[PDB]
Protein: phosphoglycerate kinase 1
Amino acid sequence: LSNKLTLDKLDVKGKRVVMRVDFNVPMKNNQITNNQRIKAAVPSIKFCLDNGAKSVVLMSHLGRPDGVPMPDKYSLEPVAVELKSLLGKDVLFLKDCVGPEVEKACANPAAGSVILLENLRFHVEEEGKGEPAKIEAFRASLSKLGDVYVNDAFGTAHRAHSSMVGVNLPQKAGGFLMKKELNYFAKALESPERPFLAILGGAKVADAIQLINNMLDKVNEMIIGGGMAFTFLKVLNNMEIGTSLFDEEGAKIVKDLMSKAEKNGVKITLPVDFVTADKFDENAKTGQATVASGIPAGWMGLDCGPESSKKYAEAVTRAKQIVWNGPVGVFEWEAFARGTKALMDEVVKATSRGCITIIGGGDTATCCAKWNTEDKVSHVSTGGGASLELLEGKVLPGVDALSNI
Ligand SMILES: Nc1ncnc2c1ncn2[C@@H]1O[C@H](COP(=O)(O)OP(=O)(O)CP(=O)(O)O)[C@@H](O)[C@H]1O
Ligand SMILES: [Mg+2]
Structure:
């Protein structure tokens, strides 16, 4: 951000500040399981209030509602409540993010007002798919809600979405979390300790498989776990994967990615065994499978097994630096948590002997919180996919859209 406006040089006294934040917090049942991403934005928010901001309007997405209002499932209202105790100040929740009624609530608020808007992805124009003149109008509406713009949404900085790249105000500044996270990665990615291991898991398989190509020019080893592994095993091993996550598009480039890993001397560690489930449910009936046995029809692999855990542990022992994005099983549910807990144990042990260990992702960061290892690894990032795009060597669209100095 050496070429960009940042919040420390933004005059906010008497100004209304509209601020993109990443409040896409994990939720189990109906409540927040991890407030990390909300806590992480507090320094920028308090800064604005302490330095005389008239208001701070906060906007974020939550989940992937795909352009339809889904306030039953994906409302930011609970975040408003959280943000109150974290700040020491009340926050006013609006049930939308645009136009006339929100614009009114934001036009001229009482001094010191903190306002949280509803999920931006309730509108198709944020993403906007899931409409050119409406997109421009959506952007115009958001722009009216402050006099100056701050983007502190590091977690979403890889997304060229309307709230991230489309706000038209004269001053667009990166916030302190954006700065912290970018500075940490610039130092850690400048001359990584080697072997440099990427650990890839999670459930955003379509997105994550498309990052592998360029990551293979940066790392010396890769674990491909969690939900992503099934696409590779089906293609490479002709493994039966039952109802496990599968990415039909990524499947078409699996053999090319393996060839490039071979060409670049990147050792790829795929799981070899699984905990299976008869349905996607915490209380599913469970089984065991190997790559050779395959997974029976109608069942899904929701964790790796012990033999995979040993292979992952071997890769970790070799590593001098690690970036881990995506749990290696459905760790929120105890029947499917063992693989991720075991890998966590190994990643903590590596740290203790000098490995540089970087954990990224809203959900993988929740692993740290669950097993109390947030201060037992080198860095827990608010970015997941965002951090991996930095590892690929890209400029993030949400940073690119900021004002130049
Ligand atoms: N085999 C599997 N099948 C289905 N889901 C799985 C899975 N293994 C892991 N998951 C799910 O992956 C989810 C997290 O994936 P995700 O891609 O969101 O990781 P993350 O949050 O660390 C990266 P990001 O910040 O980009 O969202 C968890 O909810 C976990 O239950
Ligand atoms: Mg996630």
